[PDB]
PDB file of C-alpha atoms in Angstrom:
ATOM      1  CA  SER A   8       3.273   3.912 -15.847  1.00 40.06           C
ATOM      2  CA  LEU A   9       4.522   1.270 -13.319  1.00 40.38           C
ATOM      3  CA  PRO A  10       6.856  -1.363 -14.703  1.00 39.34           C
ATOM      4  CA  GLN A  11       5.852  -5.015 -14.791  1.00 42.12           C
ATOM      5  CA  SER A  12       9.042  -5.949 -12.640  1.00 40.40           C
ATOM      6  CA  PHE A  13       7.715  -3.660  -9.992  1.00 36.78           C
ATOM      7  CA  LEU A  14       4.359  -5.006 -10.116  1.00 35.07           C
ATOM      8  CA  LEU A  15       5.714  -8.710  -9.662  1.00 35.31           C
ATOM      9  CA  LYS A  16       7.831  -7.377  -6.587  1.00 36.79           C
ATOM     10  CA  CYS A  17       4.504  -5.880  -5.238  1.00 35.51           C
ATOM     11  CA  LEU A  18       2.591  -9.327  -5.869  1.00 34.90           C
ATOM     12  CA  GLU A  19       5.480 -10.984  -3.985  1.00 34.97           C
ATOM     13  CA  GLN A  20       5.341  -8.504  -1.181  1.00 37.08           C
ATOM     14  CA  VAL A  21       1.428  -8.417  -0.845  1.00 38.27           C
ATOM     15  CA  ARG A  22       1.289 -12.346  -0.770  1.00 36.13           C
ATOM     16  CA  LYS A  23       4.151 -12.244   2.038  1.00 33.32           C
ATOM     17  CA  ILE A  24       2.179  -9.857   4.243  1.00 32.66           C
ATOM     18  CA  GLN A  25      -1.215 -11.872   3.524  1.00 37.46           C
ATOM     19  CA  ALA A  26       0.678 -15.169   4.498  1.00 35.61           C
ATOM     20  CA  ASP A  27       1.901 -13.426   7.742  1.00 36.26           C
ATOM     21  CA  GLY A  28      -1.724 -12.175   8.576  1.00 38.50           C
ATOM     22  CA  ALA A  29      -2.954 -15.774   7.852  1.00 37.45           C
ATOM     23  CA  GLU A  30      -0.531 -17.258  10.481  1.00 37.02           C
ATOM     24  CA  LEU A  31      -1.428 -14.515  12.986  1.00 38.89           C
ATOM     25  CA  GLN A  32      -5.160 -15.492  12.867  1.00 38.73           C
ATOM     26  CA  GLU A  33      -4.162 -19.322  13.166  1.00 35.78           C
ATOM     27  CA  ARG A  34      -2.228 -18.663  16.215  1.00 35.70           C
ATOM     28  CA  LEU A  35      -4.935 -16.234  17.869  1.00 37.42           C
ATOM     29  CA  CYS A  36      -7.614 -19.292  17.171  1.00 37.18           C
ATOM     30  CA  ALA A  37      -5.049 -21.800  18.453  1.00 37.96           C
ATOM     31  CA  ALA A  38      -3.568 -20.006  21.625  1.00 36.78           C
ATOM     32  CA  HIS A  39      -6.538 -17.881  22.573  1.00 37.46           C
ATOM     33  CA  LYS A  40      -9.613 -19.551  20.718  1.00 37.64           C
ATOM     34  CA  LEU A  41     -10.578 -16.454  18.891  1.00 35.47           C
ATOM     35  CA  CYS A  42     -11.498 -18.522  15.684  1.00 35.87           C
ATOM     36  CA  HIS A  43     -14.385 -16.644  13.956  1.00 33.78           C
ATOM     37  CA  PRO A  44     -13.262 -13.292  12.394  1.00 31.47           C
ATOM     38  CA  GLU A  45     -16.812 -12.653  10.902  1.00 33.79           C
ATOM     39  CA  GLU A  46     -18.296 -12.592  14.430  1.00 29.16           C
ATOM     40  CA  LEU A  47     -15.388 -10.264  15.738  1.00 29.97           C
ATOM     41  CA  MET A  48     -15.900  -7.906  12.842  1.00 28.74           C
ATOM     42  CA  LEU A  49     -18.946  -6.513  14.341  1.00 29.23           C
ATOM     43  CA  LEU A  50     -17.045  -4.909  17.026  1.00 26.63           C
ATOM     44  CA  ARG A  51     -14.603  -2.673  14.963  1.00 23.26           C
ATOM     45  CA  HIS A  52     -16.450   0.523  15.721  1.00 22.19           C
ATOM     46  CA  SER A  53     -16.697  -0.290  19.557  1.00 22.26           C
ATOM     47  CA  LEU A  54     -12.965  -0.665  19.426  1.00 22.35           C
ATOM     48  CA  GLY A  55     -12.346   2.464  17.371  1.00 23.55           C
ATOM     49  CA  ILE A  56     -10.421   0.572  14.560  1.00 24.39           C
ATOM     50  CA  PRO A  57     -10.330   2.888  11.623  1.00 27.95           C
ATOM     51  CA  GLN A  58     -10.055   1.775   7.723  1.00 28.66           C
ATOM     52  CA  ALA A  59      -7.641   3.264   5.245  1.00 29.81           C
ATOM     53  CA  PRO A  60      -9.246   5.049   2.223  1.00 28.75           C
ATOM     54  CA  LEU A  61      -8.194   3.841  -1.412  1.00 31.15           C
ATOM     55  CA  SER A  62     -10.632   5.834  -3.507  1.00 29.51           C
ATOM     56  CA  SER A  63      -7.824   6.822  -5.878  1.00 30.73           C
ATOM     57  CA  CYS A  64      -7.075   3.161  -6.611  1.00 30.00           C
ATOM     58  CA  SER A  65     -10.602   2.460  -7.822  1.00 26.40           C
ATOM     59  CA  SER A  66     -11.164   2.132 -11.490  1.00 29.66           C
ATOM     60  CA  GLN A  67     -13.782   5.010 -11.332  1.00 28.49           C
ATOM     61  CA  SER A  68     -11.229   7.474  -9.952  1.00 28.65           C
ATOM     62  CA  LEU A  69      -8.101   6.075 -10.577  1.00 28.06           C
ATOM     63  CA  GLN A  70      -4.957   8.286 -10.079  1.00 30.01           C
ATOM     64  CA  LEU A  71      -1.423   7.220 -10.006  1.00 30.08           C
ATOM     65  CA  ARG A  72      -0.171   9.532  -7.475  1.00 30.99           C
ATOM     66  CA  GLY A  73      -3.239   9.397  -5.430  1.00 27.86           C
ATOM     67  CA  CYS A  74      -3.511   5.570  -5.356  1.00 26.78           C
ATOM     68  CA  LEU A  75       0.334   5.240  -4.535  1.00 28.20           C
ATOM     69  CA  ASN A  76      -0.010   7.849  -1.970  1.00 27.64           C
ATOM     70  CA  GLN A  77      -3.109   6.463  -0.345  1.00 28.34           C
ATOM     71  CA  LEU A  78      -1.552   2.868  -0.318  1.00 27.34           C
ATOM     72  CA  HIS A  79       1.554   4.424   1.416  1.00 25.95           C
ATOM     73  CA  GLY A  80      -0.580   6.294   4.010  1.00 30.52           C
ATOM     74  CA  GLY A  81      -2.567   3.275   4.664  1.00 32.67           C
ATOM     75  CA  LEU A  82       0.346   0.979   5.291  1.00 30.39           C
ATOM     76  CA  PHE A  83       1.609   3.482   7.864  1.00 31.01           C
ATOM     77  CA  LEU A  84      -1.827   3.416   9.560  1.00 31.56           C
ATOM     78  CA  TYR A  85      -1.412  -0.455   9.912  1.00 33.17           C
ATOM     79  CA  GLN A  86       2.139   0.078  11.266  1.00 32.79           C
ATOM     80  CA  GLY A  87       0.778   2.226  14.005  1.00 30.05           C
ATOM     81  CA  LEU A  88      -2.350  -0.080  14.736  1.00 29.80           C
ATOM     82  CA  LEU A  89       0.180  -3.052  14.915  1.00 28.22           C
ATOM     83  CA  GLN A  90       2.438  -1.136  17.332  1.00 26.73           C
ATOM     84  CA  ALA A  91      -0.521  -0.183  19.338  1.00 26.57           C
ATOM     85  CA  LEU A  92      -1.481  -4.046  20.129  1.00 27.95           C
ATOM     86  CA  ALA A  93       1.791  -4.198  21.923  1.00 25.97           C
ATOM     87  CA  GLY A  94       2.730  -7.755  21.147  1.00 27.49           C
ATOM     88  CA  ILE A  95      -0.771  -8.918  21.957  1.00 25.63           C
ATOM     89  CA  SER A  96       0.512 -11.740  24.145  1.00 24.70           C
ATOM     90  CA  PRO A  97       3.787 -13.465  24.635  1.00 25.69           C
ATOM     91  CA  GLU A  98       2.548 -16.319  22.436  1.00 29.64           C
ATOM     92  CA  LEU A  99       1.738 -13.895  19.467  1.00 26.74           C
ATOM     93  CA  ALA A 100       4.439 -11.423  19.817  1.00 27.84           C
ATOM     94  CA  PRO A 101       7.062 -13.093  17.328  1.00 26.89           C
ATOM     95  CA  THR A 102       4.331 -13.524  14.685  1.00 26.13           C
ATOM     96  CA  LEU A 103       3.499  -9.725  15.109  1.00 30.14           C
ATOM     97  CA  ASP A 104       7.093  -8.576  14.721  1.00 28.96           C
ATOM     98  CA  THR A 105       7.400 -10.500  11.325  1.00 30.06           C
ATOM     99  CA  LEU A 106       3.990  -8.739  10.172  1.00 30.62           C
ATOM    100  CA  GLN A 107       5.362  -5.404  11.340  1.00 29.12           C
ATOM    101  CA  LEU A 108       8.817  -5.953   9.447  1.00 27.56           C
ATOM    102  CA  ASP A 109       6.917  -6.900   6.185  1.00 28.25           C
ATOM    103  CA  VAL A 110       4.511  -4.176   6.227  1.00 30.88           C
ATOM    104  CA  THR A 111       7.049  -1.437   6.736  1.00 27.16           C
ATOM    105  CA  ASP A 112       9.563  -3.138   4.207  1.00 26.34           C
ATOM    106  CA  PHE A 113       6.794  -2.761   1.535  1.00 24.84           C
ATOM    107  CA  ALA A 114       5.602   0.707   2.527  1.00 26.93           C
ATOM    108  CA  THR A 115       9.380   1.898   2.051  1.00 26.48           C
ATOM    109  CA  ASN A 116       9.566   0.264  -1.477  1.00 24.57           C
ATOM    110  CA  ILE A 117       6.416   2.048  -2.390  1.00 24.85           C
ATOM    111  CA  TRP A 118       7.821   5.461  -1.149  1.00 26.66           C
ATOM    112  CA  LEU A 119      11.147   5.132  -3.262  1.00 25.98           C
ATOM    113  CA  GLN A 120       8.953   4.172  -6.343  1.00 28.61           C
ATOM    114  CA  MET A 121       7.055   7.241  -5.922  1.00 29.28           C
ATOM    115  CA  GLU A 122      10.202   9.253  -5.395  1.00 26.27           C
ATOM    116  CA  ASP A 123      11.710   7.613  -8.749  1.00 24.35           C
ATOM    117  CA  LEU A 124       8.163   8.787 -10.605  1.00 25.21           C
ATOM    118  CA  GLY A 125       7.221  12.007  -8.893  1.00 26.19           C
ATOM    119  CA  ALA A 126       6.548  13.420  -5.135  1.00 25.68           C
ATOM    120  CA  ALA A 127       5.778  11.161  -1.882  1.00 24.87           C
ATOM    121  CA  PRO A 128       5.167  12.156   1.677  1.00 21.77           C
ATOM    122  CA  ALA A 136      -5.498   9.609  15.722  1.00 17.23           C
ATOM    123  CA  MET A 137      -5.004   6.101  17.378  1.00 15.40           C
ATOM    124  CA  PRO A 138      -7.312   3.782  19.290  1.00 16.59           C
ATOM    125  CA  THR A 139      -5.731   2.253  22.441  1.00 16.45           C
ATOM    126  CA  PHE A 140      -6.016  -1.467  23.210  1.00 17.23           C
ATOM    127  CA  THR A 141      -5.847  -1.746  26.875  1.00 15.31           C
ATOM    128  CA  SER A 142      -7.205  -5.181  27.923  1.00 16.21           C
ATOM    129  CA  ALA A 143      -6.096  -8.625  26.936  1.00 18.22           C
ATOM    130  CA  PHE A 144      -9.477  -8.936  25.040  1.00 15.99           C
ATOM    131  CA  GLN A 145      -9.080  -5.726  23.208  1.00 15.39           C
ATOM    132  CA  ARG A 146      -5.588  -6.577  22.054  1.00 14.78           C
ATOM    133  CA  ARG A 147      -6.407 -10.281  21.083  1.00 17.72           C
ATOM    134  CA  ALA A 148      -9.586  -9.118  19.107  1.00 18.21           C
ATOM    135  CA  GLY A 149      -7.674  -5.988  17.708  1.00 17.48           C
ATOM    136  CA  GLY A 150      -5.121  -8.420  16.333  1.00 17.80           C
ATOM    137  CA  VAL A 151      -7.692 -10.609  14.443  1.00 15.64           C
ATOM    138  CA  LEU A 152      -9.556  -7.460  13.008  1.00 13.46           C
ATOM    139  CA  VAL A 153      -6.358  -5.556  11.892  1.00 13.11           C
ATOM    140  CA  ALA A 154      -5.067  -8.896  10.161  1.00 14.07           C
ATOM    141  CA  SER A 155      -8.553  -9.102   8.354  1.00 15.87           C
ATOM    142  CA  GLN A 156      -8.765  -5.565   7.432  1.00 15.25           C
ATOM    143  CA  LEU A 157      -5.117  -5.391   6.204  1.00 16.35           C
ATOM    144  CA  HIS A 158      -5.909  -8.421   3.897  1.00 17.15           C
ATOM    145  CA  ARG A 159      -8.769  -6.817   2.186  1.00 17.78           C
ATOM    146  CA  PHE A 160      -6.962  -3.346   2.087  1.00 16.88           C
ATOM    147  CA  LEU A 161      -4.085  -5.083   0.109  1.00 14.82           C
ATOM    148  CA  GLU A 162      -6.405  -6.875  -2.514  1.00 16.75           C
ATOM    149  CA  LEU A 163      -7.980  -3.517  -3.337  1.00 13.56           C
ATOM    150  CA  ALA A 164      -4.560  -1.755  -3.353  1.00 16.56           C
ATOM    151  CA  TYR A 165      -3.081  -4.516  -5.689  1.00 17.64           C
ATOM    152  CA  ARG A 166      -6.187  -4.207  -8.066  1.00 17.83           C
ATOM    153  CA  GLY A 167      -5.303  -0.437  -8.235  1.00 17.75           C
ATOM    154  CA  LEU A 168      -1.670  -1.208  -8.864  1.00 16.82           C
ATOM    155  CA  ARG A 169      -2.566  -3.598 -11.725  1.00 16.05           C
ATOM    156  CA  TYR A 170      -4.700  -1.084 -13.542  1.00 15.87           C
ATOM    157  CA  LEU A 171      -1.646   1.232 -13.487  1.00 19.70           C
ATOM    158  CA  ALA A 172       0.885  -1.158 -15.040  1.00 19.06           C
TER     159      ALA A 172
END
């Protein structure tokens, strides 16, 4: 139901967000020496970082409106979480603004496709420097994986 031209634009946009997330983590390691995301992942629940559901994009319970709607809802959660980091630090802030623009640009394209197809439409605080810097490497990590799953769901509906 999704045209291949749309799928290739989605590929382009998810690879762009992934490259942004990669640079964010490089920079957090370089500037602030947070260089092991597997160690930090153990702290997500302590920091209250939520995960966005994509059950409608799994092959078992694939649904076109549901998958697309959950990808859009998920991308707004990540907009909100990036916004909650407040730049992380003067060294990371430019990299965060590019990620924020690329996430939001993609989320708008999804809404418009849902409109041309049929019908589209809570937060942790990060108060200390450590909370903001560790929040930055976990959100980038979670967003990478969330996009892999969403893209698999998208492929299936092509």
